[PDB]
Design a protein around this ligand. Sequence first.
Ligand SMILES: [Cl-]
Ligand SMILES: [Cl-]
Ligand SMILES: [Cl-]
Ligand SMILES: [Mg+2]
Ligand SMILES: [Mg+2]
Ligand SMILES: [Mg+2]
Ligand SMILES: [Mg+2]
Ligand SMILES: [Mg+2]
Ligand SMILES: [Mg+2]
Ligand SMILES: [Mg+2]
Ligand SMILES: [Mg+2]
Ligand SMILES: [Mg+2]
Ligand SMILES: [Mg+2]
Ligand SMILES: [Mg+2]
Ligand SMILES: [Mg+2]
Ligand SMILES: [Mg+2]
Ligand SMILES: [Mg+2]
Ligand code: NA
Ligand code: NA
Ligand code: NA
Ligand code: NA
Ligand code: NA
Ligand code: NA
Ligand code: NA
Ligand code: NA
Ligand code: NA
Ligand code: NA
Ligand code: NA
Ligand code: NA
Ligand code: NA
Ligand code: NA
Ligand code: NA
Ligand code: NA
Ligand code: NA
Ligand code: NA
Ligand code: NA
Ligand code: NA
Ligand code: NA
Lengths: 145, 246, 115, 119
Amino acid sequence: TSKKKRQRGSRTHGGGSHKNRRGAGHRGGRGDAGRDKHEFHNHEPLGKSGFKRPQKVQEEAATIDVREIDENVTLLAADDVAEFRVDVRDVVEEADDADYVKVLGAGQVRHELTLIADDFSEGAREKVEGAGGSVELTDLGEERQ
Amino acid sequence: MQATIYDLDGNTDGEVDLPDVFETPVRSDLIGKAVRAAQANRKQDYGSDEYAGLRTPAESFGSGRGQAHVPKLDGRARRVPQAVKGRSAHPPKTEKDRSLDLNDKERQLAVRSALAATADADLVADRGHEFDRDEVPVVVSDDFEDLVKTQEVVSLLEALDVHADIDRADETKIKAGQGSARGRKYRRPASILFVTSDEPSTAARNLAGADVATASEVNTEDLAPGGAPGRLTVFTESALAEVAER
Amino acid sequence: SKTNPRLSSLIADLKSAARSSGGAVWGDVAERLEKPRRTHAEVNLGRIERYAQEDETVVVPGKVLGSGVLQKDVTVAAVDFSGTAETKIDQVGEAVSLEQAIENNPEGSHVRVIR
Amino acid sequence: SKQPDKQRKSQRRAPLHERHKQVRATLSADLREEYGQRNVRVNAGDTVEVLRGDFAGEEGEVINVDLDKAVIHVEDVTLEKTDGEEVPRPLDTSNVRVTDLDLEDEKREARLESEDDSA
RNA sequence: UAUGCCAGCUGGUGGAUUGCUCGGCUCAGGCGCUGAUGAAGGACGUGCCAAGCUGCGAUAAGCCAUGGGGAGCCGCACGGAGGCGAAGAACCAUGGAUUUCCGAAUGAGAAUCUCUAACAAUUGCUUCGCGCAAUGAGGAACCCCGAGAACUGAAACAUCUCAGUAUCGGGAGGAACAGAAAACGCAAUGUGAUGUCGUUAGUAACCGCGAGUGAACGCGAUACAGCCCAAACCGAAGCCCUCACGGGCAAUGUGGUGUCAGGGCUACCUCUCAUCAGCCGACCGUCUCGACGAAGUCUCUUGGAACAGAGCGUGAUACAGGGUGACAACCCCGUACUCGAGACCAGUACGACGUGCGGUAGUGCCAGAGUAGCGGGGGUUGGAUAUCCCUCGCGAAUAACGCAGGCAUCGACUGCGAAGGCUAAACACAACCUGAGACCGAUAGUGAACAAGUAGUGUGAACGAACGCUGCAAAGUACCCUCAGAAGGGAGGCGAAAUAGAGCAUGAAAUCAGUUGGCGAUCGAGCGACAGGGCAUACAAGGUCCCUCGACGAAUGAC
RNA sequence: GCAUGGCAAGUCUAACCGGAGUAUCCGGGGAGGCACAGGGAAACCGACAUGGCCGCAGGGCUUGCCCGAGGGCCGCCGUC
Ligand SMILES: [Cl-]
Ligand SMILES: [Cl-]
Ligand SMILES: [Cl-]
Ligand SMILES: [Mg+2]
Ligand SMILES: [Mg+2]
Ligand SMILES: [Mg+2]
Ligand SMILES: [Mg+2]
Ligand SMILES: [Mg+2]
Ligand SMILES: [Mg+2]
Ligand SMILES: [Mg+2]
Ligand SMILES: [Mg+2]
Ligand SMILES: [Mg+2]
Ligand SMILES: [Mg+2]
Ligand SMILES: [Mg+2]
Ligand SMILES: [Mg+2]
Ligand SMILES: [Mg+2]
Ligand SMILES: [Mg+2]
Ligand code: NA
Ligand code: NA
Ligand code: NA
Ligand code: NA
Ligand code: NA
Ligand code: NA
Ligand code: NA
Ligand code: NA
Ligand code: NA
Ligand code: NA
Ligand code: NA
Ligand code: NA
Ligand code: NA
Ligand code: NA
Ligand code: NA
Ligand code: NA
Ligand code: NA
Ligand code: NA
Ligand code: NA
Ligand code: NA
Ligand code: NA
């Protein structure tokens, strides 16, 4: 049995005095009325903040952490093995509607990896080299200067 | 497990491997959910006229004449819900979404589960079906798809000791209630489901309580009418094989 | 108000075992499965690999998921495993149903609970 | 039309020529065999036998056929009025069987015999 | 024991209840314009007797033809009389005839009539004559173009919001509108007419930066289709009316060419399968309608009636639904299967006829002006400097030019040619046809199951109800008595039932008549709850209860 | 938010398309959404698959002593 189902006979259906459930006055005004007065509590403050650059001057990087690549090297049997060598661009999803692919360095690298991507973070490089690996910058990656 | 194939005389004729799906653990809660959705999804939208009871300029006189403040016209009350001829306060509405969603996986699982319930003689007996057989479902040669006369499917069924179920479904019930005024006067037990491969069995369809289906599109409802698992079914050699991949 | 008849039976079986046999885990696992689904365990392989040890059966009072890497040769018992989890685990160890666990070990000894 | 209201309506409002089908009766075993039809439109010339009313068992010649009320008057199938007069008791052709046919019409007989049309 | 209280019984009043559904409500598929050749609507007529409704129109519930249909019929409407139909009526389909008056209403006037040949009025053509034509008005909503609130929200209120909503003016179609880039701008080595659906996204943008408001490109789909002028260069090679003769139009340019795969011109190359014009002209599908269509009306029992129970038997590519004296696959309609017709798809697709596509080089020959653009003032929009539009003023270039790419200018780059025009299909609505339903079931559901936009109210605009059910069959009560009596009553008759007897199935409560039990003319008022006594009670569906004694015997506990 | 159920580092399809027993239903459709990394107005940069300590349940042991998921207290890391 539901709460609603048990209201018949209660007269007020849980609203308290029958003088309560009337119009918007019982809500302190329609919608966000009073967000600056009687109901300012828990509303983000009034005001303008910052600016936005035009949508078409924005670049969206397609990222991936080494942890993800590394945890599935063996599993990526359909990808170069050598002295592994993986082209990140072929791993990352959303790597099409992306302005470029970037490898981030979260997690560990327990294998020797040769990574090819449009960009890398210090942490990603240090980790990939520290595990006896290398990081190759793509042609698009030739945008560093 | 093994599946004893039968010929059109009802005599054993070799046997095939009962596909794995018939081992899918029986989940009556999921089966029930699948049937519930299929039943909801074919219900039609309805609702009273948006303006029923509002076609009037009736007005309230207010205080002054020892009368309740009720809109009246020509000295007759109108519009308000407590008024005879007034609007329906919270009526059925066309806009209401009367359909039920169901994840494909949850649904397909229910299909597999209802399939499996079909291979359990005890379940099939509890569902209510009448029969004197130990093996189930009943598998038959693809030649069944060539039968043309209902009577012939009858003999085959009597030979397979399964005709008793049709005897069961050979009784209509004249329902209590006003469904009768809307064309729902009768209802009857569900009997044997015949699953073929090329086309539903035209020869078996008119049998009392029988339903015909095809392996590629047989669903939870025909496999478990009203959400109850374990329908006395009869597959076709090929049908049995197709169902395997569902 | 559980709906799954199987989950329901598992729960009753877990109890029968904690009562009859000297088990305490089974009753513990039973009480957690009785609690709301949102509280049931959802463990990835990375956690099993970090706290499990060989010859000690890992017991998940919920479901095991496939993220991370498992190398240890352990036996994991859970309510269910995702398809990938069960595949990765059987390559280095063994994925087992809580129903089998209760049978091969109704006393629930040498078990490690992971959530 | 599977809806009861529509079924009854189309039966009650059927135009005159669509009402002939409402005054049809099953034929005797002999007649069925003779013409290859299970029933016929009872005519005011045929002889018929009552199979269901209080008059079940009696036989007589059809005296009248009313299309609008889809009913027939069979000779001697009557009711005793208060004044003593004897009036016909309307019968539904559905409770009647034709044992003899009035074939004075070339057209009716033709229809009966052909195998692509029924009378 | 008057007046009277409480409960019940018999009869009534009333019309709830249950059962029933000729009506609604909603969804879906199909289809879709009518009118000066006088529509839609209205008025008045029209029947043997005819008031209402329906139909019809002085040929008036109809006339004719063809096809279907069939032995009956003369609408709803079952009377009386009379008639029609084998000379094939009724009835249905298609086509035709007739079709009064008012009505856009058009010769003129007028509350449906009247006065002395009439496209009134405005237009095009024009034989300049109403000679040939057009417009007008209607339609359920949908559609397009204009005019455009306020209550309300912001807890007041002015911008904002309600809302470009309600409402008003103009107008089209079966669908409208839009539409082959002076586009987009995931900026690109990219996309490629237009609607619409899903999403993009409550994102960008707007806003007393409050409340609120609110796209687009793209993407996935649906459906797909692309073309014609103006001009250059030609220059009467042309078009309309008429059978013809003949007339009219046209150098202020008819017609040829041509239209960013730029074109023209000159010299060449190749070639046509583009396009445009015209001819023919569907299949399938879908919607509706129609033909044919299997198998019991056997036994016994109950019953007024078998469609019930028991028994025996049958069909099924048909066990949807309905009807028939009660629960019917086999009694009747129908239903499955097969087949036929009309409509829509569509004057479309296909096919074919004619035309001729395209490429090179040269050439500043051609290419839409109050325009592009700027300024003042407003409206509108998410459009912010960067929406779209109006108004007043100003105002350019000529492809070697010009516009756009979300502030302005200059250069670069990329895209694209405004100020001429057309365009199928996919999408909206629901009048109309059909189908459907966990919708309602006569105070519900439409206002409307009935005389329903009826009766009735208001000067008018406008407002606006209630009313469903005898019975299997009318067998709808003959005869007699009574009476002022075709009333009513008595007796009687029919039927299973008249307590089914006419607004007649069932027949609640409030409540009324008579009557039964209890109380009752010396007595006190929330009408009762719990205890306990009187009196009252057919059965059934409850069967217990009383007293002696004895057994057990908590707390408590004596003379 | 919560309860139940499917699947799980993923999950779900929308419009729509095909089939069919033709509004149900079977198959297809991942466009796109949310989740999988955050911080910053922006430019732009880009994280613990565990380093230490308490310790509930549970497990272990020679019965206080170990191991102790979750939980708790710290360290440490990304960014402004
Ligand atoms: Cl930004
Ligand atoms: Cl985890
Ligand atoms: Cl694009
Ligand atoms: Mg109403
Ligand atoms: Mg009922
Ligand atoms: Mg015949
Ligand atoms: Mg006039
Ligand atoms: Mg206000
Ligand atoms: Mg304010
Ligand atoms: Mg707005
Ligand atoms: Mg855009
Ligand atoms: Mg031309
Ligand atoms: Mg505005
Ligand atoms: Mg009503
Ligand atoms: Mg007045
Ligand atoms: Mg009555
Ligand atoms: Mg995508
Ligand atoms: Na409350
Ligand atoms: Na209240
Ligand atoms: Na408020
Ligand atoms: Na304030
Ligand atoms: Na009204
Ligand atoms: Na009053
Ligand atoms: Na809906
Ligand atoms: Na139409
Ligand atoms: Na009349
Ligand atoms: Na006419
Ligand atoms: Na005219
Ligand atoms: Na003239
Ligand atoms: Na206010
Ligand atoms: Na005020
Ligand atoms: Na504002
Ligand atoms: Na894209
Ligand atoms: Na009958
Ligand atoms: Na201006
Ligand atoms: Na542009
Ligand atoms: Na009524
Ligand atoms: Na996707």
